[PDB]
């Protein structure tokens, strides 16, 4: 009395679209990552700026995506090594790359696919980058399936060990204090990108916040995302850890310095550490 | 009210989390699977490049690219090759393959794109068309038969087969499913196509709709390199006598058939119970 | 981290709203199905009152007591009969019918409960046993053979049979599956039955794994009454074979009866040129 | 690239169980409402009194359930008609109805199976009952599925009509304000029935732009467990949900666990029942 499949989960054939690969769901999805490739000059501007006044040109990108962010870097004649665990993302990355092959900079650029929770051995680095990004909040996709954010810990482990002695990692996600106190994603400025109906929904587990959901909608259909709420204090301390204390921690909000106490309130935040030992 | 709520949408990835359903105990014997099957025997590697010659054949077209296996092998011998797959998950070796090889001149010109069978019409740029075109591998046989009319079954072979330059060539093939249709079972393992160093064992499930067959359900339990474990996968049965007249309407009839057991020719009734059937048409013009 | 979420867990009801999938398309039309089947045809009962008379049997155990239609028919008769059925959503009709007639002394002594074949052992006391046990309307084949050894069938056979007093009778039916399995199609609407007023159109899957069959499945359309509308359900069924199930259903006694099968309530022959819709085993226990 | 099914859901079979029935949930469940048939003293003190100060005696239970409630009005001698949507739920209500037929208390008592946003065709009441209940925080069973609490409207609209002019309805639910501020809603704090099984409850707030939209609750038991959802309706938005519900022609009234409620007081309830007495 249960259910016969036709295709094992997770297997594909020759001839045959993936699994949900053409639902309505992933095509909504498509123009959303696709229409947010475009980046905005603010952006585009803190980046590049950051990594200079640093010395950095060995970058590693753990969140890689779709490659936006490391295909600037690599226009900017940074050494860039692209990763992510999602090979659905990693495909249009490395369309890019092939398609601009001729340019002696993405002929060197490298892609590769790897997890955090084993980017130790997926990705041989030895000494480590100059510095390794994780933006876009992406760190926040990463659930707790424990319920004691293990994953989170050994994650942002790995992601550290990444980063070569005297190195830098810039790592952010959404303001979700502010998510979780007012149950609604914060106003449509444009500060990532000049990129909508999006419901959102916060699940507490015994009043600790578990997972905020969005509902993105464009018109007639939607798709949606969770996110593990992480709130600028614990994730300060949990970055911090992942060092072991071995750093210089800093925050922004929406690229300016953070000022606990301040009026304006960040969109996202973003963690400047330089590891020292 | 019952209702199942979702972490994310189906078909959705996100940076930094492994995509849908990638690392199952099945989805990981079949990569074992696709893994050992990136050979093919010598056999099968002259009969290809052997009618591919005969023809005179240059530009080819391989809709079926899968992991690149035969594609690979017609780019090394100096043909002009454009390869093809719905599938994005085994386009990914192709394309993975043809990067590493990137500084060899041929492999610099290796085209390979996304596309459908279905709406191969505009995924890909024709009205030239190809010297040859190739199906193999019993890739076809993975569309099934949805609306039950085999539409869809015509629809592909119909833009496949206009991928023909005329007087171009076809290649194409699906197993034996006579056999398999009268017996239930697919025949024990050998497989000419390529050499398995892997053992395996075949559950065969046939599912019969008023009489018509409709589907035929292999699950493959391969033998762990130390460590059982298995997956599935559906086929249409399609039978010689049906697939030879879909084919040759596929052309108008404009065309010369022939078709093939295990790289030999066919005859009806003869002895020998063929494992492959390959349909071979010559376009007229 | 993919996951399917629930408001409410599988099998679990709350009280104001309706149970899980109670209203869908499919059990609607299913609902009328059963509700044009309260009916069986003059020949089926005929049959039926004539063989229990003719063995003389009183008490009787109907096993696959669905809505309760033939039951119903036997309380009527005056015979003391005890209903059982493993599908609480079928037994729900026949326990409604007793209600209403509650007044009538052979209804307030009609016994409904609930009991699986697979447990019937201990599910309704037995000890004693009942002159007949009926098991009609291929109710049988409804069990699967999830194992793959036919250990369920043999089990529930065996505990429908120790139902059975020494000297007693077992009725017991399924659907012509070697027809079915050779044709691919189940026979053109006929059914002696029951008189179906309702139109129906039959599609008919037929699994076989590694060329032994394993199950049937039955898509039935439906014409809704005024909507010349037309939905389906589906129902699965074991293809039970002819000499399997002969060997199969004597087993369940040890060997210890006599065996005889009609085909569409008249003797069979095998190599008679009529083919039966139905089977019909009908067992008399040795003791 | 589907799933074939064997049957169709809802769907019965002679001779198998139902789906789902015999499920690790189904089973935990099972013992959830079997080992709550045992009310308390205080609430059936309570109930019988206040339907006994209004003169009531026609009593329409549209929360049946297993009908331990309405049992206790049958064994009083009031004329009870009981009814629910779910027909799992039924059964076991119309099985005891069954035992106790030769009582002739329970001959007359009347089950049926009816929805409350359809309780007007599928229930003929005409005149009406002295007396509607729907206790046991049932109401909050019934989900908001279009997000503007239409279905919650029609289903109190539905169920005021049951009660004959003059006549009273007593409704509950559990303390929500509550919950949504704690996360938490205590395991075991009841006042209808004494629980006698040992039960750990996991409590699941959902928000959907920062408006309360759904509590679900994990029941684990010794291993095994099982889930319910609820609509978390607040004392204020439900008092007047249930006023409009007659249109304002009525006598609205609060109690906090039996002892009435007092705005402000510093005993927190766990139950809020609403006693309406309908004037036009
Ligand atoms: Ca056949
Ligand atoms: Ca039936």
Redesign the interface.
Known sequence: ???????????????????????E??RV?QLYIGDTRSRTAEYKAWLLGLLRQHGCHRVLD????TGVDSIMLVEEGFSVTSV??????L?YA?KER?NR?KEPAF?KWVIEEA??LTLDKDVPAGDGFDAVI?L?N??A???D?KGDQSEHRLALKNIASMVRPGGLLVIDHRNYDYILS???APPGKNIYYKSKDI??????????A??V?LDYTVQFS?????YYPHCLASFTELVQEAFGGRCQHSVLGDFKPYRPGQAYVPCYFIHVLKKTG
């Not at 094992?8 to 679209?17: K, Q």
């Not at 753990?62 to 995506?65: L, S």
């Open positions: 009395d249960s259910v016969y499949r036709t295709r094992s989960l997770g297997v594909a054939a020759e001839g045959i679209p993936d699994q949900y690969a053409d639902g769901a992933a999805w753990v969140a890689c995506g992510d665990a999602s090979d659905k993302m495909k490395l092939w092959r002929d997890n955090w994780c876009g992406s760190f996709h990463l659930p399936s007012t149950g609604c419901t959102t929904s916060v699940l507490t587990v015994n009043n600790k578990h997972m959901t939607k798709f949606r995302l969770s």
